[PDB]
Design a protein around this ligand. Structure first.
Ligand SMILES: CC(C)(Cc1ccc2ccccc2c1)NC[C@@H](O)COc1cccc(Cl)c1C#N
Ligand SMILES: CC(C)(Cc1ccc2ccccc2c1)NC[C@@H](O)COc1cccc(Cl)c1C#N
Lengths: 793, 792
């Protein structure tokens, strides 16, 4: 197959596929010549590290007497070259003998089995590469234990029949990222994904999970190492134009480094980085000089494994010692820039030169290679101890450990369950997937150099139930580089009491607009979807803090206008009592004998009842009070006006007393008949002003109250007209002139109150009316009596 | 598999066709030895296609102009629609090249018993063909598929030898979108198969729909494994839509349960978009079911031209077939016996009707024929190649006996030839063909009653977008026997007069018709908003346009106007009668009794008052509204002052000067305030939307109150001066009539003020006049009438 290979032949052969070259040189064949295979022109240090890890694991299983004794494990490692075709060719190389045996018309070669039967293949890294290799291998039922290919597409086992892997699936990684976002109560986070089969499925699963967990995705940008600098700067700009301070990065370190450089140039030190496993264990991004730019990064990393003497084994790389692996020779030349360019001697010191794969603090992928190799070796050991009555096949059938076939190793690897050298339990299911415990780490400085120290800040345990898989000690984690405070990640602040969240079209539900509740609608609890409207009995303050009270409004005994009205009423009652006492004392004085004694007594009584009816419209209104406040005025003042009228009728020239009685009787019958027809009541009219409520009175019929007020006005007009005819004539101590003057006062008041009844309607209606009915009373009882007092005291 | 279709020749062609349609219904638990299992459901049409390939090979052999004296061999493997089976066959094809390429494997010392195959025909499974090309692309061995059509197969970062003889599904989806767009429909429901054919097609159709504003109601997936509940849900969502045009992108077996369910529920009359998969399938198209699903339009491949193909099909025989083992199986399953009862194999299939024998068109077989002839033409291109002249580096090309696949691939990627019918066929470097899709609609034949597929148009890819599709709509019979294009918009176009408003919850193509508000007009059908009329006009009930709002003010010609004109002319007649009586008599005793000049002034003021009544008439003007109130003031104050100076001298040339002084003070106040704030005319629209009123507004309301109060006060003074003096007779008892006339004036004022208030409306300019005239009609009557009564 490929010219470069690592081959050693023993009794058992394991497939080998790792990318030792960093990149294949892209090339399009002109088709004018015979087929040409594209070639890699780069070199990968970590791929060589993983290859060395596989070789050391195989050698250590060979040396260990307890595991697989009396056996030799050979290897055939072919560089992936990051190419599907190269891996397919290498896989073909692996399957030579069983393919020849299983293909008709090829048995005629009479082959002597020149290729030992490869049992299983370690690799490969490329996910689609792994898919194709599994497609080809499942035809022969030869197991493939991948170490770096992780994708939910690899979980489809209708095309795969021998697929197994030793790397956590991307579904778990995306779900763990979603769990990290959900745990810290964030909903506004940016997402960046790699433009490959590793980042795109991850971000798709992340979005699908965020749909369930009510998590929003501000932006979904794809970056790589081939993206233009303009694209990277555009990503940086939309990051700055983003409210989210938490950025979930699901990509590789090489894919992220240009963006990291651009952000470092622009000094954005407020973004929280969620790190995928690919770039959480890379030294291309972990730059302490850049730490303050990207400090506080949270990431998933594989726990360090136990590989004794791995660094010493790496120091044993030598083109002379290593003859079964040619790749090392290449790694030699690039270190010294010689080609045996000057000639290499093969003895130059290498301990004083550092390359990325030599330096490590923890092992993540080499550990996966080690575990996969040991899983294969443990299946081989289960075959080694197989007995006629032991094994996973019926009839208790086993196979020779020296002639082991892959169609038996496949069953052993599917039902395998053992313990690691550290003590970790390793098992497999019907899916054949191995998922480990991701370690959640943050970035810290060192108080001696300042180097980035990966402090374990939590663990994600896949063996636990979902909802408890994540554990994070928030105390250790730094935020914004070194600060100790959970950063705020929401599209909008939580609307406090008095502000509701209003759904806004064109934005996801996580981003809400806070809206002030209308007055009269209360929001007691913070973060309420709507504003609860207060009951009509009360009303809401602007703070909307649990609406408490409202404003009742009506005339009261205690208030400035109320005090003035009370004083005026008591003065009027005092004058009325003065007149009554003067009348009581004198019985046969000439001036009293001049007018009719009974009629004057009736007039005084009607004036008293009028002053009382003035007081009758006071205090908080009641149904009967509003039912009678107008009839009281009507009847009382009509009685008084009719008494004055019958004085004037006899003046002009016991009929007069009966006339007063008949008039007041007709009015009172009308009043009671209409009162039974439609009684006035009291209404608590809220719809006048929201803040203040008025409890007023409403009549049975407006026109019928107009009838009574017009009746009183008409009787007053008749009295005034009669006195006006008699104004000049002096009779009964010139009573007629005072009658005219008093009727003038009453008619003036009746004209005057109505503009004040209308203009200053407000609350003071119940006020103004009284200050009318009293004052008009204060007129009459004064005038028609004052003169008679002035001479008789 | 253990059965193969192999014939040996100088050149070997690869064959991958599904002889069986199903797959093994059991996957082992691997508790026993693991081994491949066999597909269990046969496919007659796959064997038919294999026979078509064999017939094409035989035709090439018989033709003396294409590859003479060169036998074309074949190695055809049954697919089972299985990925691994095709992978094993591909391995079989690439044995020698791989072994030579493999290191430490050439020690097998193979004599190269079977030469490497140059090209592979097949396969049907698109996902299968994916891995097939993945493996073949390693060695650059051309693979010309015939039934695998998918845009996912158009990738060229992995497919490096892939070619196909079936047009890409992108063209099919775009053509479906073009059918929807051409017939002007926006609401269509889409059903797709749960496989590698329906799903990419519906995805591409959805992608194309956004560009062409096509809207998709529902996207449902159906398959042969779907329960009856799923199919019934699909039927319900079909019935729950206004769309009669159904975009169906599915295979026949997947669609058949849905077809049976719809036939059961009797939904008569619909439009179906038929994919190539079910363009003419006998599992769907049946004469009995025509009335249920009549009016179907679908895409099909062009009819092929393969003479003798039916004869070769009639020539199949298990004893006469030595290079095709599967034919034996074809003889068994048809007759339900093995070569249960046994058969010798001496039967005949010509007289027995089976789906294999029956056919009316050639779509897949034509693709197989075209692929085989394309490979043959590439071989002939190698045949004509020279070592110093060719399409290669330095003209290097090996002998025809030493044919290599990579030489075949270069010729195939640049092929441009003509068919037996003469049609031009060319390929590209994308592995795609540029074939044309014909459009077929279902018609009944009154000769038999069978369904006849009439070619109603074509979708040609040799033209740019917007012109590729060509349909003769006249031929098409719609749902049932209807000749009218069915309606398939989301909702009817909002008629001019009502607007279309956006609603969220359904695609923006679907709109809500809302009646335009009054004051805004909709002059165009389908407008997102209602155009507001200019404030000079107002919209009619139909809201079609706004042509007339209303013009409102007192006019000479109207019932109240006629009454007012009659009353005014009567008043002017009485005034002229008084004036003439005054003119005639000069020294009569009654005129000498009162001051002659003062009475003349009173008559003049009454005339000016009647004129001022007329002054508030017709359409208002700036100066007219500027003076209509001062005119009343000045004139009636002059009259009232003349009566007042009569009364003042009665009670006991000062009186005339007093009138002049009073009217002068009023007129100076009037002019000073008139220069301060002139009244004008306002065309108040905000009183009622339909009708606009042109009224007058003063400079200051309180200032007009001043003048009216001045007039009322002078009237009160006159009434008082004549009130107590009512009894005293002087100057023919003038005082009594003075009191009576002042009463009339005051009554009229208190009478029109509530009339001015209540019936405001239009009749303000009416009511005021019927006041100012009637009050005038009072005074000029009273203070004069008595004097006429005795003197005539
Ligand atoms: C009639 C009166 C004003 C009582 C009253 C008091 C003192 C007086 C003193 C001197 C002479 C007459 C007097 C009359 N009470 C009427 C009010 O309650 C009720 O009226 C209304 C009630 C409802 C709606 C309206 Cl729009 C009105 C009025 N307008
Ligand atoms: C004062 C007058 C009514 C003229 C007039 C006519 C005839 C008369 C006959 C006898 C005695 C007085 C008379 C007065 N013109 C007033 C009207 O234009 C304008 O007033 C208003 C204008 C605007 C708004 C209001 Cl709310 C009012 C009133 N209110």
């Amino acid at each position: 197959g490929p010219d470069q290979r690592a081959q050693k032949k023993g009794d058992i052969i394991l497939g080998g596929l790792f990318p030792i070259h960093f990149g294949v040189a892209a090339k399009d064949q002109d088709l004018k010549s015979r087929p040409e295979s594209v070639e890699c022109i780069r070199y990968n240090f970590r791929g060589f590290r993983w290859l060395q890890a596989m070789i050391f694991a195989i050698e250590e299983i060979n040396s260990s007497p307890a595991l697989l004794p009396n056996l030799t494990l050979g290897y055939r490692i072919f560089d992936t070259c990051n190419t599907v075709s190269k891996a397919l060719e290498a896989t073909l190389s692996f399957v030579a003998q069983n393919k020849i045996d299983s293909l008709n018309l090829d048995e005629f070669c009479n082959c002597s089995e020149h290729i030992p039967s490869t049992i299983a293949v370690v690799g490969a890294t490329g996910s689609g590469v792994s898919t194709a290799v599994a497609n080809l291998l499942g035809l022969f039922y030869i197991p493939q234990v991948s170490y770096a290919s992780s994708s939910r597409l690899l979980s489809n086992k209708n095309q795969f029949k021998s697929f197994l892997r030793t790397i956590p699936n991307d579904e778990h990684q995306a779900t763990a990222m979603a769990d990290i976002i959900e745990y810290f109560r964030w909903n506004w986070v940016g997402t960046i994904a790699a433009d490959d089969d590793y980042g795109r499925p991850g971000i798709e699963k992340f979005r699908e999970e965020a749909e369930e967990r009510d998590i929003c995705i501000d932006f979904s940008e794809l970056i790589s190492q081939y993206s233009d600098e303009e694209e990277i700067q555009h990503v940086v700009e939309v990051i700055q134009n983003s409210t989210a301070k938490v950025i979930v990065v699901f990509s590789s370190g090489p894919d992220l480094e240009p963006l990291i450089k651009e952000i470092v140039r622009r000094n954005i030190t407020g973004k929280i980085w969620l790190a995928s496993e690919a770039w959480a264990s890379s030294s291309l991004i972990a730059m302490p000089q850049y730490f303050h730019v990207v400090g506080g990064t949270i990431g998933f990393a594989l726990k360090a494994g136990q590989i004794p003497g791995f660094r010493e084994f790496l120091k044993k790389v030598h083109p002379r010692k290593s003859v079964h692996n040619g790749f090392a020779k290449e790694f030699w030349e690039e270190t010294f820039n010689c080609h045996l360019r000057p000639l290499c001697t093969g003895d130059e010191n290498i301990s004083s030169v550092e390359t990325p794969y030599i330096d490590y603090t923890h092992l993540r992928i080499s550990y996966n290679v080690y575990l996969a190799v040991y899983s294969i070796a443990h299946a081989l050991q289960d075959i080694y101890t197989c007995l006629p009555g032991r094994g996973l096949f019926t009839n208790g059938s086993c196979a020779d450990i020296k002639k082991v076939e892959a169609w038996q190793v496949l069953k052993h690897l599917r039902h395998l369950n053992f313990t690691n050298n550290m003590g970790e339990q390793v098992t497999f299911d019907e899916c054949g997937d191995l998922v480990g415990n991701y370690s959640i780490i943050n970035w810290h400085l060192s108080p001696e150099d300042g180097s980035i120290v990966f402090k374990e800040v939590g663990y994600y345990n896949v063996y636990a139930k979902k909802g408890e898989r994540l554990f994070i000690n928030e105390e250790k984690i730094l935020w914004s580089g070194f600060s100790r405070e959970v950063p705020f990640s929401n599209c909008s602040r939580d609307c406090l009491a008095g502000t509701r969240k209003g759904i806004i079209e064109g934005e996801p539900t996580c981003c809400f607009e806070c809206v002030e509740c209308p007055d009269g609608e209360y929001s007691d609890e913070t973060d309420a979807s709507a504003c609860n409207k207060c009951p009509d009995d009360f009303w809401s303050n602007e703070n909307h803090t649990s609406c408490i009270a409202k404003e009742i409004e009506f005339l009261s005994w205690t208030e400035p206008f109320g005090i003035a009205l009370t004083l005026f009423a008591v003065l009027g009652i005092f004058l009325t009592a003065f007149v009554l006492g003067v009348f009581i004392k004198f019985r046969n004085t000439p001036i009293v004998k001049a007018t009719n004694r009974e009629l004057s007594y009736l007039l005084l009584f009607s004036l008293l009842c009028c002053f009382s009816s003035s007081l009758f419209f006071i205090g908080e209104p009641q149904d009967w009070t509003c039912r009678l406040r107008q009839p009281a005025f009507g009847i009382s003042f009509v009685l008084c006006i009719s008494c004055i009228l019958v004085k004037t009728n006899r003046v002009l020239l016991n009929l007069q007393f009966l006339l007063v009685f008949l008039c007041t009787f007709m009015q009172i019958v009308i009043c009671v008949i209409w009162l039974y027809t439609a009684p006035p009541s009291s209404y608590r009219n809220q719809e006048l002003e929201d803040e203040i409520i008025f409890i007023t009175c409403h009549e049975g019929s407006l026109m019928a109250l107009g009838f009574l007020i017009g009746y009183t006005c008409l009787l007053a007009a008749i009295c005034f007209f009669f006195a006006f005819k008699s104004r000049k004539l002096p009779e009964n101590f010139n009573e007629a002139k005072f009658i005219t003057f008093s009727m003038l006062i009453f008619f003036i008041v009746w004209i005057s109150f109505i503009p004040a009844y209308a203009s200053t309607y407000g609350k003071f209606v119940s006020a103004v009316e009284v200050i009318a009915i009293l004052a008009a009373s204060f007129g009459l009882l004064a005038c028609i009596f004052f003169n008679k007092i002035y001479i008789i005291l």
